[PDB]
Each structure stands twice: as structure tokens, then as C-alpha cells.
């Protein structure tokens, strides 16, 4: 793992010791190379997971997330070059350093064998994110957004720390290999129920749930493009990874302590997908779609069946890619008109014909167009739930309908229709942002070709 | 102030706590406390303004009352069991009044109403001393008698200090009062664990000291005493915003900064004794403590408040400050968690 | 050694530096009254040092290269435009007035630092004590608002008491018609459209507050323009003064030590000029301020500290 | 009204450099950033990593399990045994309670 982390560190001196002109090229290229190096984790020729030390490891669940996190860095760097073009060299270097630190901390979190390192880094991913949001966001709601984002997470995480320390005092170690073989039934009691709550609510607030999801749209709306990308793609997957890892020691309390959360998720899916219809802000639309999608992940993880974990992993990967893509697409038009409203620019297929194919393909991946992996996850989650209770497919299906509806609405009222002739400032598409969409899309094709990689420990 | 007077007074300030630490007899601990509070006053009132005079009065009266109470405790423990230093066979009333008076001195809640004012009325280099060097001797006393302290009283005092520090520094515009309430909260932490393990309260003290000293140094760089003033650092000393933000986030208790280590290793040692509720509440309110540090980070570094037409001059001129110790302490106060095993034991 | 407690103990005490002419003098007066030449002659004859009047570019002529800067750095204030459009809705009037007060504060600090260090006297053409004159002149003429006056007086009662007043004041009275004629004889196009009421207000402020306020702590010598000439006459009136009124007598080596440690810290001098009172006449804004600050740092001898810019001929940087 | 600079005017980045790729205002930097991005993203990563993955053998023991299932069904049909026993663990290994 050091062979993936130490290069990510040396990227920092490469960022600072580089000439102002060649600072972006070097870091971008070497980040691509590190994304390449991260592909050795897929060399799993057995059912024996990779343990590199007492601290670093990588299972079939953490490897996809690590590769996605190593691959998103250069895309964020690229997306973050049109803005920052008028900022000073030191500010650009500081932005790049924030992004690199995020990459490093996330790779650590996904490689961690122990839950205390996971927690420390889970929390350390707040500093660079908050800085990015509040320092390079454009409107004044930056600050309230950062506040929400900090304190939802911390108020959720503190109980998690208490519960981890309790488990330490009771068992002797917070290692994940040991806590899986040395396990005991949790006697059903209010104490252990509060332990379940403590262990879960931090992640549930980070996925997020329906009842607690207001920190996400504020951030995405008020966050620069890179922050939105990393947030949507990884900083939500963080909670699902945590739940999947920690739900082994909460058996069987998960059988009856889940109904509230399964239910909230299944219903908030509908609520959010419906919000995505009467929504003026494109970024808010993307965020509410993300919430609708993560609700399924939460429910799946709650029922903890193999099909369920598999669909959840696939949906995590695919949603990360496609949401990063949609935010890139939105910011493309934002850089022209400097407005987030989806009603102002509504004929962009008559000027950007190629960029519209990216909109089309993304909105098709947003909805479940097969054989996309955005669809296999939804399908296996639907199947797991149907097995759970045959009355879930009702809500699943109305969510499907609403999903198609608002994705089509997005692309229609944004690209199709009559062009806004007063928008003389609609410069053609930049090779850079086109490369961005291509790099977001092609990996989806490749995964759809080889889904065995993004299944997870269950398969 | 001439160098002879400065020598005598600073030597006395230093000597006070040394006697308290290095003494077996309680009476000499008392005279050390008295040296401290007698020598510190002229350094407060040196500026000679009404605020300084009333700060001095509020400090002197409080510390004198607390010292008289400690002396009563010592004299009762002498009348009983005919020795000076306390022993296992000593009245809990004596021990608890002693603890209460030591809190009064330290400034713990609900004995805190005097510390914010006394710190607002004086200069900053003295607030530094007041909040760092004058909180040791009391803690020495408490660490020599930790097996005998009641856990109920210290824990009530600690949760009260936490809550009141948070709620009080929450709506402060002056920085000195923010530091006063930070001291109150971190002392609540220091004290919540003292009977179980006093090797951790000393750790939290060292960390709080190396954290607050460079903050006070920053404030003294441009004699900054308000939020609106530090908002002007991006124009005067932008090379300080990084360290400021990191030290603030550490004081709040955020990983991966070593201000989180005291919080974490105290919650641990408390749950090793089944104090779930205390540690829970303490953490949940340390969050609120962090909140206003974050608002302050906003005001200072993560956004750029308006400046004045005259700061251009300050830009023209040169500066000899800070010294080498600021960078040292600010680095050893944020980027040292990896060495925690070496710090904890 | 950079002055401090230690150097003060080992020596470098002030009272031994002083002599019969270690005095601070501020020859005041209205515009075009004859202050600069008289100050120069006094300096020359008494062996004092001459400090020309402090304008907009003092902090530049006394720092770095010692040359003028672009005006976006030195106050963004103009006297020419002050005379052209005094009641401007941009705020150049009080901007200029406060910048000038701060420059005179810096100048007085430098002058005291020189006197105390070397014991040499100094001659000033105006002072922070005679700068409210123009302010009240403006206010009486609606050039500025009362809020600006309150800001000014706040900074005054924050900065002024920490400094020792001058020893002698030399006011050269000149009627307003004489100066309103000299200003035209000078031929400066912008100064010619100054109103005689402004000058009468300056004169009234002087006569009513300054002189009777300074005649309690420093000797005032009031001269007319015929005595102002033959500057040997004023020198003779100076050489035979009896300094028996003021705070300079209840002084000692340690008061001087602390005052010197202050005036040799220009940032601690100017601290109270940057207080965050958000007047829309001097509040600069983050974008403008940051553009200006980044450009100023891009300036050859200003990117780093003095002695650390190899771009201007500094070599042993790897060894400091 | 306090002093600030006025909101600037948007610029057409193709105005001065029509052969603009979106990376930098300086052309040479622009071209070389474009080339490095394309190279290291498509030519290097999306090709060589794709191949490296496509040629990972026996991913999570998938081919081996198939071969062994073939071996086992063959052996068990040839030796009369069934293809799957309802009990993984031989009961001899198991000692159930002496419930009374």
C-alpha cells in the first residue's frame, strides 16, 4: 500500500517545488500513473484477501473504492483549471494539496484494518473538504454549508468513537480480521440497541439518510466542482463501507433495529426523486438524485444479504462515476453563464452537439438503462428487497418511474428546445472538459464489460 | 519598570509554583500559591488603567479567599492526625473544601465568573502567564492527593466547566474571553480524569499550553483583541493563517491533530472505569467548543473581511516578530499525533 | 544589538546622549507661510536634523528603495483631486487626511527614535498635534461628515498620548489674503482654487485650540512674516529658552527606554490606525486589497524581507 | 459607497488563441498539458491497465472452482455418491447437547 501512498505524498513536493507553469501537468500525469499503480490490487487469484501489514489491507470491497479515489484526482485537477486560472500560484498549489490530501486520507481509510485509523481519517477528510468549500465557493452560503457538513458528521461520529472504545475495552482489539472470527451474539437489550445506534448513525448521516440529508445539497450547491465530485463519489461511499465493515459485530440486532431505517430510506427515495422534478437548481437536482440512490444502498446494507451487498457495491461505484460526470457537465455550462438554474440555458444541443451525447449517456446511466452497472445494482437490490418483503417493489417501481422522469426533464429542458439567442457567450466546448466526460464514461463501459470486479466480498 | 524590579517579580512568579511542586509540607504549597498571586498583580496593573485595576481587584480577592480556605483545610488536617500532609484518614469535608478552593483559584465552573473579566482587562502576555503557568501549582496539589478526591464533585465541576465554557465562548467577540473559556473547558477535561489517572491531565495541560501560547503570540503580533481585528491578518501577516487555523482546529479536538489526543485518551480511560455518560456529554459539548473556533477560522483565513486604507503602511514596513518558538510550538501542537504512544505513557 | 532591555542595561541610555539642543521643534503655520525654509535654517544653525513635511509618499521614501510608489499603494489619495473636487462622493478627502495623520505619526516616531538614540535634535514642519487643523477646516466646509471626525479623534486619543509633545512650537502667522495671494504667485494650478474660508478655518483652529493647548506644555514662539525672515532671529529666541513646562522633565532612563522600544516598532505605532471601524471612505474591500497586496509583493524589493531579495543584490541568503 | 474594484468583464478565451484546448492561456503549456493528459489517461492507463486486468488469471478462484467442481461431480457420479450432502460437517465431529 505504501507503493500507492508514498507517491501520493511526493506529489505534494512535486506540486510546490514545480514552476508555476508546469505544476498542473506534472501532478496530473503522475496522478494518472498512481491510478495505474493502484490496479495491482485487482490481482486476487484466491479467496485470501490481501493483508500487507498490521494496518493496511485491501479486500474486494476496498479495492474498487481505492481505484476510484486514485482515478478521480486527475479529473478533479482538470475540472479545477478553468476556475483558479485567475488565482495566484500559491492558491492553486494549496487547492491541489487539499485534493491530494483527500486522496491520501481516503486511500488510507479504505486500506485500514483497524476502525480507529478508519475513524481518525474519516474525520480528517473534513478539514480539506471544508476548506475547499468555504474558500473557493462563490456564494455566501458557503459558510452555513460548511457548518452543516461539519456538525452533522461530528454529532454522528462522537457516539461512534464511544462505541469503538467500548468494543475495545470489551474485546481487546478493534481489528477487523479478529472481530470477525471472534464474535458473539449480542443479547437483545436497550444498551446494545444504543450501541447499534452509535455505530450506525454516523454513517447513516454520511450516506445520507432521508431525515438527515440537508447538509448534502447545501454543500454540492455551494461547493466548487472538485469538492462536489469527490463528495458525491467517495465521501458518501465512506458511510456504506463503514456500515458493511461494522455490521458483523451487531448481529442479530440488525434484524429488528433496521425497519426504521429501511423504511425511511425506501420512502425518502420517492420523496427525493420527486423533489428532483420541482427543482430549479441543477446541482440540487443531482444531489437529491444522489440521496435517492444512496437510500437503496442503506436499505440493502440493512437487510445484509449477498445479492444486497453486491448490488450496493455496484451502485456505489456507478453512482460515483455518473454523479461526478453530471456535476462536470453542469459546471461546463455554469462557466459560460454563471448561473445554476436549469431554465436559462435550454437549447444547448444546437451549439454543443457532442457535449449533449455526454448528457444523454449520463442521464441514461442515472436512470437504469441496461446493461449499465447502475442498473445491475438497482436490480439485485430490488431482488433482495422483494425476497425481504414482496411489497417493496411498489416503491422501487415508482422510484424508477420518477427517475426516468426527472432525468429526461433535465436533458430536455437543458439541451432540447429553442436556443436562448441572447447567450452570445456560449463558447464551444473545451478539449479538457470533453476529456473529462470521456474519462468518466469509458470506465463505465469497461466495468459493464467486466462486472466481476465491482461485486464485493459476497461474490 | 526597571530591571531589578522585573527580576525580583518574575523570579517570584517562577519560584511560587516551584516551591509548591518541590514541597512535602502543605503550608509551603500555600506560601508558594501566595508568592504567585502576590507577584502576578503588578504585572497586571502595570498599564495603569481602570480595567487593569479592577481586574487586579477581582483576581486578588478571589485568590485570597481561596488561599484562606486551603489554609483552613491544612489547619484542620493538622488538628486531626497531627501531621501536615493529607492522608487516607482525613475528613472528606476537608478534602472537598480543598478541591473547591483549588477550583476557585483555577477558575473552574461554577467558580469561573472572574476569569474572563480578569483576562479581558489585562494585556496578552499576562493572560498567557495567567492561563498557563498559574494553573500548575493547584494541579500539582490535586495530583498529589488524587486517590482521596471525590469523583462526584470533580465530575460535576467538569461537566459544568465544559458546558459553561462552550456556551460562554459561543457569543464572545473579544478574543481574550474566548481563550478564558477555552481554558475553563480544557481544565474541566484535565479534572474529569484526575482521580482515575493524573498522568493524562498533565498531558492535556502540556498540550493546551503549547496550543494557547502561540495563539496568544499571534494575537500579540498585531495586538489583536477582536474577531474583526484578526480578520485583517490576510493583509498584515497572511503567513500566519495556516498555523492559526491548524491550532484552532486542534484546540477544538479534530483529528488528525494532537488536540484530539487528550479528548480521546481521556474518554478511553474514563470508559475503562465505566463513565460512559460523562465522557459522552463532554465530547458532545467539545463539539460546541469547536464551533466558534470554526466561525473564527472563517472570519480570519477562509474568507477575507474588509481592510483599511492605512494597513498599506504596515505592508510597507518590516517586522522582527515572531520568534523561533512560535513555529516550533505550533508544529508540535498540530502535527505530533503520530507520536501519541510516546506522549501518553 | 537591536535595542532592548539588555543594551539599555549595558549602556545606550538616553539621558547621557542629550545636550543643550536635543529638542523637538514643530514650526507650524498656514499654507505658503514659510515653514520649510525656516525649518531648514534652524536645523542647519542649531545642528539639529531637518524632517521635511510628511506627505503621501513618506512611508515609501523612508522604506525599501526610498523612491515613490504608485498611488494605489500609497493611500489611493490625491491632494490635486482634493482641491479639484473636495465634496467627492468617493471619499478622497478623509482618506487623504487619515493617510497624512498616519504619515506624520510615523514621522514623529522616526524623529523621536533618532533623538533618543543619538541625542540629536530634530525640526518638523508640522506634527500630529497640528493635523486636526485641516480636519476641522474640512468639516466646517462640509467636505466630510461627522463620523470621519469621530474616527479621526478616536485614532488621535489612541496614538497621541503615548508620545512626548515637542519642546518648542514656532507659529508664523500670516493673514489669509497674503497667503491667498502667495498661492497664486506659486502658480500650482490645483492649489489656486482653494477657498479663503478653508484657510480662515485653518487659522481659527490654530489660534483657538492649538496655540492655547500647546502653550501649557511647550514654549510657543509666535512670529510674523517679517520676523520669520532673518532666521537667525528665531534661532536666537530658541537658544535662550527656559524649558520649565512639560512632561520632558519628569522623565528618566527607563521611560525613555520604553518609549524608544515603542517608536522603533513601526507596526506597533501604526496598529491603532488600522482599527476595524468600517467607514466607507477608507474600507478597501477584499478583492481590491488583495490585488494591491499581491502586486506590492511582486514589487522588486518587497517580495521578501530586506536583505533576502537576491533580485536587488543580496547574496548570503543561504547563510542567514 | 466603499471602495472595491468593479466586477470584471467575461472574456472569450478563443479570441486571442483560437487553437485553445481549455488548460492554460500560454499555448505551449496548453498543448503539452493536453498531450500529457491524453497520453497518460488513454494511451497508458485505459490501455495497459485494461490489459493487465483482462489478463488477471483465476480471479478470486473462479476457474479453479469450476475445474474442481468438474473433478468432483465426475468422481461422485462414478463412485455412486451424491453431488451434495445436506450436512457440511461430518456429525462425528459434532457433539450435540445431552439435553434432558
Amino acid at each position: 500500500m505504501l507503493k500507492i501512498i508514498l507517491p501520493s505524498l511526493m506529489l505534494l513536493p512535486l506540486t510546490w517545488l514545480s514552476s508555476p507553469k508546469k505544476t498542473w501537468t506534472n501532478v496530473t500525469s503522475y496522478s494518472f500513473l498512481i491510478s495505474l499503480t493502484s490496479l495491482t490490487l485487482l490481482w486476487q487469484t484466491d479467496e485470501n484477501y490481501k493483508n500487507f501489514s498490521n494496518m493496511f489491507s485491501s479486500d474486494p470491497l476496498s479495492t474498487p473504492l481505492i481505484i476510484l479515489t486514485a482515478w478521480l484526482l486527475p479529473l478533479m485537477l482538470m475540472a479545477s483549471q478553468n476556475h483558479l486560472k485567475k488565482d495566484n500560484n500559491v492558491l492553486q498549489k494549496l487547492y491541489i494539496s487539499m485534493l491530494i490530501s483527500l486522496q491520501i486520507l481516503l486511500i488510507m481509510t479504505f486500506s485500514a484494518t483497524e476502525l480507529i485509523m478508519f475513524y481518525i481519517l474519516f474525520e480528517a477528510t473534513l478539514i480539506p473538504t471544508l476548506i475547499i468549500i468555504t474558500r473557493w465557493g462563490n456564494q455566501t452560503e458557503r459558510l452555513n454549508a460548511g457548518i452543516y457538513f461539519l456538525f452533522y458528521t461530528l454529532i454522528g461520529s462522537i457516539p461512534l468513537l464511544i462505541a469503538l472504545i467500548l468494543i475495545q475495552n470489551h474485546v481487546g482489539t478493534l481489528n477487523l480480521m479478529i472481530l470477525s472470527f471472534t464474535t458473539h451474539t449480542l443479547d437483545a437489550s436497550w444498551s446494545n440497541n444504543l450501541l447499534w445506534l452509535a455505530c450506525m448513525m454516523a454513517f447513516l448521516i454520511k450516506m445520507p439518510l432521508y431525515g438527515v440529508h440537508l447538509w448534502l445539497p447545501k454543500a454540492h450547491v455551494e461547493a466548487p466542482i472538485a469538492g462536489s465530485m469527490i463528495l458525491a463519489a467517495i465521501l458518501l461511499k465512506l458511510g456504506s463501507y463503514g456500515m458493511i465493515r461494522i455490521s458483523i459485530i451487531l448481529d442479530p440486532l440488525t434484524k429488528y433495529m433496521a425497519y426504521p431505517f429501511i423504511l425511511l430510506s425506501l420512502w425518502g427515495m420517492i420523496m427525493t426523486s420527486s423533489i428532483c422534478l420541482r427543482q430549479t437548481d441543477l446541482k440540487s437536482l443531482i444531489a437529491y438524485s444522489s440521496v435517492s440512490h444512496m437510500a437503496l444502498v442503506i436499505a440493502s446494507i440493512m437487510i445484509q444479504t449477498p445479492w444486497s451487498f453486491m448490488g450496493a457495491t455496484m451502485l456505489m461505484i456507478a453512482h460515483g462515476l455518473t454523479s461526478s460526470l453530471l456535476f462536470c457537465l453542469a459546471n461546463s455550462n455554469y462557466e459560460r453563464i454563471h448561473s445554476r438554474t436549469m431554465i436559462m440555458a435550454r437549447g444547448l444541443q444546437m451549439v454543443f452537439p457532442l457535449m449533449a451525447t455526454w448528457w444523454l449517456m449520463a442521464s441514461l446511466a442515472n436512470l437504469a438503462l441496461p446493461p449499465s452497472i447502475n442498473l445491475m445494482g438497482e436490480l439485485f437490490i430490488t431482488m433482495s428487497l422483494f425476497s425481504w418483503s414482496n411489497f417493496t417493489i411498489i416503491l422501487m417501481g415508482i422510484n424508477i418511474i420518477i427517475t426516468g422522469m426527472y432525468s429526461m426533464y433535465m436533458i430536455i429542458t437543458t439541451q432540447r428546445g429553442k436556443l436562448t439567442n441572447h447567450m452570445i457567450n456560449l463558447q464551444p466546448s473545451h478539449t479538457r472538459e470533453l476529456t473529462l466526460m470521456a474519462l468518466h464514461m469509458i470506465p463505465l463501459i469497461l466495468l459493464t464489460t467486466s462486472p466481476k470486479l465491482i461485486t464485493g466480498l459476497t461474490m | 519598570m526597571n530591571p531589578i524590579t522585573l527580576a525580583i517579580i518574575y523570579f517570584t512568579i517562577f519560584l511560587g509554583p516551584v516551591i509548591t511542586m518541590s514541597s512535602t509540607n502543605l503550608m509551603l504549597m500555600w506560601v508558594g500559591l501566595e508568592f504567585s498571586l502576590l507577584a502576578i498583580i503588578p504585572m497586571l496593573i502595570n498599564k495603569k488603567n481602570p480595567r487593569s485595576t479592577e481586574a487586579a481587584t477581582k483576581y486578588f480577592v478571589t485568590q485570597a479567599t481561596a488561599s484562606m480556605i486551603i489554609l483552613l483545610a491544612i489547619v484542620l488536617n493538622y488538628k486531626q492526625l497531627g501531621t501536615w500532609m493529607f492522608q487516607q484518614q482525613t475528613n472528606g469535608l476537608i478534602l472537598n473544601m480543598t478541591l473547591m478552593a483549588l477550583s476557585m483559584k483555577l477558575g473552574l465552573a461554577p467558580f469561573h465568573f472572574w476569569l474572563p473579566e480578569v483576562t479581558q482587562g489585562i494585556p496578552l502576555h499576562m493572560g498567557l502567564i495567567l492561563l498557563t503557568w498559574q494553573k500548575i501549582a493547584p494541579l500539582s496539589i490535586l495530583i498529589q492527593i488524587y486517590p482521596l478526591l471525590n469523583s462526584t464533585i470533580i465530575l460535576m465541576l467538569a461537566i459544568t466547566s465544559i458546558f459553561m465554557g462552550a456556551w460562554g465562548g459561543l457569543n464572545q467577540t473579544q478574543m481574550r474571553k474566548i481563550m478564558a473559556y477555552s481554558s475553563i473547558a480544557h481544565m474541566g477535561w484535565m479534572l474529569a480524569i484526575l482521580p482515575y489517572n493524573p498522568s493524562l491531565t498533565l498531558l492535556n495541560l502540556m498540550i493546551y499550553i503549547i496550543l494557547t501560547a502561540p495563539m496568544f503570540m499571534a494575537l500579540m503580533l498585531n495586538n489583536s483583541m477582536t474577531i474583526n481585528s484578526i480578520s485583517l491578518l490576510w493583509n498584515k501577516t497572511p503567513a500566519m493563517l495556516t498555523m492559526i487555523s491548524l491550532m484552532l482546529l486542534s484546540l477544538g479536538g479534530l483529528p488528525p491533530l494532537t488536540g484530539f489526543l487528550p479528548k480521546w485518551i481521556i474518554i478511553t480511560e474514563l470508559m475503562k472505569n465505566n463513565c460512559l455518560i460523562m465522557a459522552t456529554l463532554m465530547a458532545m459539548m467539545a463539539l460546541l467548543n469547536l464551533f466558534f473556533y470554526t466561525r473564527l477560522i472563517y472570519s480570519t483565513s477562509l474568507t477575507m473581511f474588509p481592510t483599511n486604507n492605512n494597513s498599506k503602511m504596515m505592508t510597507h514596513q518590516t517586522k522582527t516578530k515572531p520568534n523561533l518558538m512560535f513555529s516550533t510550538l505550533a508544529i508540535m501542537s498540530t502535527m505530533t499525533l503520530p507520536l501519541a504512544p510516546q506522549l501518553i505513557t | 544589538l537591536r535595542y532592548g532591555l539588555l543594551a539599555a542595561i549595558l549602556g545606550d541610555k538616553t539621558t547621557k546622549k542629550l545636550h543643550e539642543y536635543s529638542r523637538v521643534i514643530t514650526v507650524d503655520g498656514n499654507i505658503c507661510s514659510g515653514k520649510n525654509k525656516l525649518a531648514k535654517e534652524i536645523a542647519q544653525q542649531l545642528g539639529m536634523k531637518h524632517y521635511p513635511e510628511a506627505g503621501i509618499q513618506y512611508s515609501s521614501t523612508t522604506t525599501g528603495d526610498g523612491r515613490p510608489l504608485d498611488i494605489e499603494f500609497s493611500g489611493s489619495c490625491s491632494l490635486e483631486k482634493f482641491y479639484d473636487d473636495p465634496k467627492s462622493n468617493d471619499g478622497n478627502s478623509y482618506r487623504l487626511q487619515s493617510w497624512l495623520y498616519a504619515s506624520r505619526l510615523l514621522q514623529y516616531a522616526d524623529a523621536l527614535e533618532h533623538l533618543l538614540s543619538t541625542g540629536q535634535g530634530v525640526v518638523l514642519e508640522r506634527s500630529i498635534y497640528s493635523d486636526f487643523v485641516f480636519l476641522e477646516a474640512m468639516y466646517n466646509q462640509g467636505y466630510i461628515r461627522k463620523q470621519c471626525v469621530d474616527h479621526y479623534n478616536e485614532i488621535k486619543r489612541l496614538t497621541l498620548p503615548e508620545y512626548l509633545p515637542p519642546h518648542a512650537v514656532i507659529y508664523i502667522d500670516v493673514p489669509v489674503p497674503e497667503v491667498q495671494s502667495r498661492i497664486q504667485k506659486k502658480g500650482d494650478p490645483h492649489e489656486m482654487k482653494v477657498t479663503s474660508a478653508y484657510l480662515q478655518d485653518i487659522e481659527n483652529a490654530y489660534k483657538k485650540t492649538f496655540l492655547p493647548k500647546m502653550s501649557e506644555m511647550c514654549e510657543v514662539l509666535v512670529y510674523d512674516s517679517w520676523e520669520a525672515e532673518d532666521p537667525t532671529k528665531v534661532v536666537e529666541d530658541i537658544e535662550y529658552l527656559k524649558y520649565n513646562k512639560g512632561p520632558w522633565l519628569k522623565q528618566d532612563d527607563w521611560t525613555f527606554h520604553y518609549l524608544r522600544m515603542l517608536v522603533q516598532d513601526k507596526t506597533e505605532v501604526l496598529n491603532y490606525t488600522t482599527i476595524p471601524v468600517y467607514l466607507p471612505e477608507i474600507t478597501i474591500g477584499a478583492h481590491q486589497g488583495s490585488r494591491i497586496y499581491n502586486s506590492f509583493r511582486e514589487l522588486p524589493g518587497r517580495k521578501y524581507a530586506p536583505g533576502y531579495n537576491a533580485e536587488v543584490g543580496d547574496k548570503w541568503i543561504w547563510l542567514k | 459607497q466603499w471602495q472595491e474594484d468593479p466586477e470584471p468583464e467575461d472574456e472569450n478565451v478563443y479570441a486571442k488563441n483560437p487553437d485553445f484546448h481549455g488548460y492554460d492561456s500560454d499555448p505551449v503549456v496548453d498543448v503539452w498539458n493536453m498531450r500529457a493528459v491524453f497520453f497518460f489517461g488513454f494511451s497508458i492507463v485505459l490501455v495497459f491497465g485494461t490489459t493487465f486486468v483482462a489478463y488477471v488469471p483465476d480471479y478470486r478462484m473462479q476457474e479453479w472452482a469450476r475445474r474442481e467442481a468438474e473433478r468432483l461431480v465426475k468422481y461422485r457420479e462414478v463412485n455412486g455418491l451424491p453431488i451434495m450432502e445436506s450436512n457440511y460437517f461430518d456429525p462425528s465431529k459434532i457433539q450435540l447437547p445431552e439435553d434432558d
Binding site: - | 467577540t173 473581511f305 | 477584499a286 | -
Partner: peptide, 19 residues
């Protein structure tokens, strides 16, 4: 278009004797 930065109305809320 421009990154919003705090104005006098924002700074004056931190300018009282209490928050």
C-alpha cells in the same frame, strides 16, 4: 461571477460587545 467576500453588513455582526 466574482467570488463573494464579506461586506460591511457581514463584518458589523462581529463588531458588538457580544455576539
Amino acid at each position: 461571477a466574482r467570488q463573494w467576500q464579506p461586506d460591511i453588513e457581514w463584518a458589523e455582526q462581529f463588531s458588538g460587545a457580544v455576539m
